[PDB]
Amino acid sequence: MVEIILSHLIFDQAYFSKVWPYMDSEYFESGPAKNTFKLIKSHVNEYHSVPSINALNVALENSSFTETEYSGVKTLISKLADSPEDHSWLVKETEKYVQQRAMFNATSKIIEIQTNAELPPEKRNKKMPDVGAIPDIMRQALSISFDSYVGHDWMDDYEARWLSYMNKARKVPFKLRILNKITKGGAETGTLNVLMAGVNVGKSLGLCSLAADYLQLGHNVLYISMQMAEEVCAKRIDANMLDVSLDDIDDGHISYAEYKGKMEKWREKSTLGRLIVKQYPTGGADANTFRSLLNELKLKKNFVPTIIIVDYLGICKSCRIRVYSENSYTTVKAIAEELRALAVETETVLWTAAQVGKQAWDSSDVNMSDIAESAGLPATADFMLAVIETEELAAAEQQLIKQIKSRYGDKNKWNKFLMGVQKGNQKWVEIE
Amino acid sequence: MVEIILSHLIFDQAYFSKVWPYMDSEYFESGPAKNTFKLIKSHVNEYHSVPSINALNVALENSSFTETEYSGVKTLISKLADSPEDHSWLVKETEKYVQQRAMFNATSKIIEIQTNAELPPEKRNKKMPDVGAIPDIMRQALSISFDSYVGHDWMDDYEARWLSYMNKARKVPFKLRILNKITKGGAETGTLNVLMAGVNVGKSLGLCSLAADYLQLGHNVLYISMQMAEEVCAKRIDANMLDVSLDDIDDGHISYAEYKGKMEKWREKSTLGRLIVKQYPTGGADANTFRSLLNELKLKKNFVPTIIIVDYLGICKSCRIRVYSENSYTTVKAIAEELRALAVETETVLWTAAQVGKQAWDSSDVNMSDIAESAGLPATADFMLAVIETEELAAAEQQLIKQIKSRYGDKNKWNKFLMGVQKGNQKWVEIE
Amino acid sequence: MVEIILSHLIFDQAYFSKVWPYMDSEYFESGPAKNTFKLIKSHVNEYHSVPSINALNVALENSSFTETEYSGVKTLISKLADSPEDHSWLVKETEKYVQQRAMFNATSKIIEIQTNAELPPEKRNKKMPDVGAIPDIMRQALSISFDSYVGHDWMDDYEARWLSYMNKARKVPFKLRILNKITKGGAETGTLNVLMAGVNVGKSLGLCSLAADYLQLGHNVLYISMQMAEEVCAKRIDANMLDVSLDDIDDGHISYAEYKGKMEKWREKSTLGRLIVKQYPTGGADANTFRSLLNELKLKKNFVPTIIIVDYLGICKSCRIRVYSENSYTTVKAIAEELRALAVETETVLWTAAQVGKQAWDSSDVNMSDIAESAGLPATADFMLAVIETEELAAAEQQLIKQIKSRYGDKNKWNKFLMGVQKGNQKWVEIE
Amino acid sequence: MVEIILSHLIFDQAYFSKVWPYMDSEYFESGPAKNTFKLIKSHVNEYHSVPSINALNVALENSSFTETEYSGVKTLISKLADSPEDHSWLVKETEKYVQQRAMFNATSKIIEIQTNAELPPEKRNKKMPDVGAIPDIMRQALSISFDSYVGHDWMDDYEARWLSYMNKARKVPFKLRILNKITKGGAETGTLNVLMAGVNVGKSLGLCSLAADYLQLGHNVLYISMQMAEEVCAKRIDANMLDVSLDDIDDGHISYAEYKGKMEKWREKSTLGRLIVKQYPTGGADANTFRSLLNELKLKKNFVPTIIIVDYLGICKSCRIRVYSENSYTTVKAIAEELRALAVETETVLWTAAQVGKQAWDSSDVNMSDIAESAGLPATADFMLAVIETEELAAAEQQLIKQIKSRYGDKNKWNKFLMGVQKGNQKWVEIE
DNA sequence: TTTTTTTTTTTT
Ligand SMILES: Nc1ncnc2c1ncn2[C@@H]1O[C@H](COP(=O)(O)OP(=O)(O)OP(O)(O)=S)[C@@H](O)[C@H]1O
Ligand SMILES: Nc1ncnc2c1ncn2[C@@H]1O[C@H](COP(=O)(O)OP(=O)(O)OP(O)(O)=S)[C@@H](O)[C@H]1O
Ligand SMILES: Nc1ncnc2c1ncn2[C@@H]1O[C@H](COP(=O)(O)OP(=O)(O)OP(O)(O)=S)[C@@H](O)[C@H]1O
Ligand SMILES: [Mg+2]
Ligand SMILES: [Mg+2]
Ligand SMILES: [Mg+2]
């Protein structure tokens, strides 16, 4: 029914107002229909009005396509004529036609991706998406229903807004009291929280301590280590949970009986979730890789995480920018934005680590301007905490956590407090 | 499109009043088109009015043509109808047709000049110009645009200019006396206004404060969130309007009774406007999306916004340049130009935020050179204020606002003024 | 007469010494002639001497030519002979032939340009000059001659040097005596003058001050703006000439009676010109449009320009390069060249205002390595000034001018001088 | 080519004496070419002289030749002419022919060696070299060059080198006795020599003086100015040559009669050179534009300079640095290297000027450490004279010349000398 | 050819 759609795009102002915002060039044909719609779209972009038959003929004469295409477009334009119709049958039929064409294009692209990925490398016609984003494309084929959400009205829609304040399902409480106090109830789902410490100051000890604390509070935690292996992170978690020093495990001061007893005692407790550690090579995982990991975890292991942790965003690969194409600023900003998009998609608290510049190392204070790889990371991150350690603090078994970007509350209040990091047990303890 | 031009010359006075000044027999053709235009020109010269079909046919009978030309003119005259096409498209198309025909005639003329130059001096014609007249014959053919307006005169139009001085309909007050004082009556419609600061300083706080202030004045405000979600921002607007807190909303200190009472009391006010909050994924919107959103808003609800707030220009996506086609100085400036064009098209006050590079994130002052993105943004901008907060300022809850680019008024009359920013209420308070 | 040219290039020495530096491969037809000239040129480049017949037959055998090309070149070489003629008819005939070939090539190139322009976007060739570049090409072809001036030859060009000593070019005086001192009487007719400055520091203030000063001297001034409405520029001029602050005009302190009285008092003065302000959209005007504008200004308004002032060079259209085709440097250089050509053609002092880079903003000193868009502007310009009102000159109500490039005198004599900028009246007063 | 080689072996002497030692029978052919060379070699052996074409025919008349060979030889002998080709092209072309034939023979020999190697060991030729001899054989093919000149060979070019020391082949005198004394006979070709302008001490005056002494000695001088026009520099040259004061020309004291008389008096003298002044914009002339200028002057003006004087090194631009700066060290170091490379590749004496540190300005003594260009100019400069001015030197019309770097001779021999500077005539006179 | 981030280095 392409002829009817074009005719009522021309000879119906009411029809054009609703269907146009959604009409696209890939929904008609590879011949006369697409060319006619391209003519109409160019005229609309140039004059912001629906062209007439004379305007279409003039644009057709000032066009460069061949004789066959010219004749087809001329016949199609000559066949366009308004008919007595009703707005509803046309809008519903157009929605059905657009949905069918979107599904057809999506399945054609799916077949193309499958037949392209099944090719020897270096001859796979790059810039074509991989099989990993096969379902997502189909998800885009179903989100076309002529029902775009205009937005949220402050006065018209306030009961629904008020039924989001006492819900509190968005906030995931910590286990430390100070972190809950500064965040006013803990971190929120669909966010990107960051730890900035430097090199060998913490920043993975803190992530492991957070993972252990969330695990004790009945949470499913997905640790993703882009550098350290799976047994080192698991060893850190074991040291945190079992209250056994990493030196004791290395020096064999803990027996198999004690280890088994502690593990079974933790297992028999109802207030304990599941922690899963996954390792990827440095620069070999992205947002799409994490989504594939999420899907295979949900299917194979029936594991649905809420506290997804990534060891370092700077070590991950952007899923949109080719490697080493853009500078550190753009690449890191894109990676952080994609991670935040993943977090809001799966509705999980995302925790990450970030390096500071060389000038901030061995300094008694770390500012937000000391971020290493990009200034956009603080802009695209919900909460950031700076971990500072000096010789005096190290001798006191304490670290100073400074609130650098506090989006859940006022950062001026409680800006710097001293945590009791214990490096042997990979644990954070409070001083209150 | 000679038929359209002749038909709208005869049957349209508005078209005749803008194209007849620039029209010649050489522009049309050498056959029936030129003869028809010559008949029209002869009739308008003998009688100062546009001829009719009957008068044109009578003149054709009076005038003498050979059989072929007579038949061609009769056939062409038979093909004239009103056909009320758009005026803008018609004038643009006739300008293009005139330009292309003039270029063709100029090329033929210079080719004839070159051919005559090679002839021996005895054989060559003295009427044709020398080769030295080739260039100006070309530039003049490139100065046949349709524009009869010459511009202001400063001595013949001072009365109209004085009347224009009294047209203050472009101004929009600020609800803040200091901002009105420094803008000489508030912001103006169709202008790009920017509120820039560092990361986590209160850019979105200022945007929401401006939205609430415009809402309390009866304006229609369209808040477009790029990083935050739609609901979170409405909470800030509620904290500004209801004037309780941000934490008290999340800590349950407000019962439903008070919330309902305050919302209904604000509904009873006749000085309140309409506020719509729209969220977009990072890097997925521009004026092209904004124009479709405007059309959908106007269709679905009686909402034509007077104020358009964009959460951040940087997070926005340029229309023509791809996601990472060019560097920051280009696409950021392109987005700024597109936003200003959208504002001047919709005649709305456009507000947006801008980021500051790391060099001024901890400085007591910020200059125009401290713009994180392209420096073309402080070229398309009109009132680029700046927010500077220090430890002493945060102690007194008083952000410093520095006038960075002031196109409305004197940038240095009140260069730096203190505000009374309340972070809990997301409100700017004037200081007296 | 290609055969004669080749024959006397090979067999004659004075002819070779006279005509060789001006010969080019494009002056010969694509048959045997161009290939033979290629062989001759390669031999001359490799051995710095005129080849013989044996040399070329050796070069022909050691060449990658097809059978047809080989046969044609061999036949042409066989046909060459030393016909005795006079070395005063040969040189002029060769010059005529070269000029004709250059004109033919230019005609073909402009025909190709016009064919390329009419093609739709995404199919048309890029980097090919637009239609507005056609006359310039035709200006280059007519300049071909066997006489070339590379540098100034002492003892060979000394009459012209004595003329330059004794004669001085006519100057359009300023009203500020300091500019006359630094320019030795003012600015010449066919010049491009630029007043670079930072953003929101007085680019339009200085241009409007110059426009008012020239208007008070009896000149016809055309003010073309792109970032400002006609009423705004005319209000700046009124503030300059009526001695009323822009604050007074906006606030309504002055009445219509006083305004009319002052305007009529200015009208009654005989030493007054005509100032016409024309506004164009950003990127919507070029040199041809300025020419079309000057055309209607000379016709509709019957006004001949004298001090054409382009508010901003960086906004105007290229007129030689398609929009968004080349980089900023090339486009701005092309705009500068087009504007200077327009000034030379119209014999009008042309004043403009470019923007300095972000580094020069709030910098107490600027140099040629501070221009933002293009560093080729000083080469095209004839006088270039700067504005250095950075931090403390604004508090003292003063400015500073660097004199970056002054072709009228010596830049290192009064390089930096202080200007009393008054922003309420939008004028420059002298510190003397 | 073989016909030409044989013809110019028979009918030339220098070509024979140059190419005979590198001529072998296997280089020509297996029919006419080889047999004909065999005749030349045979005769050259029995009678140590070149045979007459008839004597070569006598060789054919008295030699073992098959009917085809004897005929072939007769035709080839009858096809040899005494035509006069240029010697350089002939030698180069016969060298290329010999090299190609030697390479072909060596490749065929190694192919035959490989083919013989892949044969039954009982059945193979013993005379064929083993496979291990293949790399050496090709070497003998690559070691074929009519003339071997790779660098300067000590103990093999000592006689030519002595002729350089006695004839002072590299020195260019100065016309000033003191400058000749400290340079052991003047500056050398392929060198960069700079004068360290101090506190407003000078600006082109010295280089203009150097552009007159060389002119009076018969040298072709190319003066490239950046901060001045051609007329101004040539006026400084006229002041020095015509003894007219610089201000007298501007005032008009000297009339056209005296000027023309002095110019013609200079033109009569045969000891006068040519001066070509070329102007370039500031920063618009790298040391690659100078190469193009030299090529144009050689091709069109036939002007091949021996002295190149650049007005100022700092004003110049680096050929491939992209970013230019008003006063940056990296650019000055690159500019010096590029200019010295130009001097070396053009075998010309290159002169330029550069600024020095304020300390060098305040102190009468200037140290290499006290130089604006540190480790950049006293590293790429063969000679660096420090021209500084003092009020006492000024009151006596003198300038103290100090020698800061002298590759030519000992720097401490005559380091300080007083120069008689005349600022009106722009001249340097000696002091007794 | 400019523009902007980050880093590292070096020169004054
Ligand atoms: N096996 C271990 N036994 C005891 N202490 C350890 C051990 N591993 C690490 N630590 C301590 O933990 C501190 C911080 O460890 P990490 O969390 O690995 O630092 P890091 O910042 O993650 O390293 P990078 O540079 O970011 S990969 C170190 O400085 C050590 O003092
Ligand atoms: N929900 C909140 N509760 C309390 N304080 C907040 C909240 N959100 C933001 N703030 C404070 O508001 C200030 C700036 O935060 P925002 O206004 O959200 O920043 P923004 O303008 O979005 O800029 P960035 O660069 O994106 S953080 C800081 O003092 C924050 O701590
Ligand atoms: N209405 C006004 N009243 C008083 N002063 C004003 C007014 N408008 C502008 N100014 C002042 O004039 C100065 C120069 O403004 P402009 O003439 O627009 O300079 P500009 O370089 O053209 O700015 P652009 O075009 O946005 S880069 C500003 O910095 C203000 O201080
Ligand atoms: Mg780590
Ligand atoms: Mg923000
Ligand atoms: Mg301006």
Numbering used by the authors:
A (entry chain D), B (entry chain E), C (entry chain F), D (entry chain A): 1 to 432
Original authors' sentences:
The domain architecture of the gp41 helicase resembles the bacterial DnaB helicase13,14 with an NTD and a RecA-like CTD that are connected by a linking helix (LH). Here we report a series of cryo-EM structures of T4 primosome assembly intermediates.
We hypothesized that the absence of the RNA primer density in our primosome EM map was due to slow ATPγS hydrolysis by the WT gp41 helicase. We separately refined the helicase and primase regions to improve the resolution. The mutant gp41 helicase region had a resolution of 3.6 Å and revealed a structure essentially the same as the WT helicase.
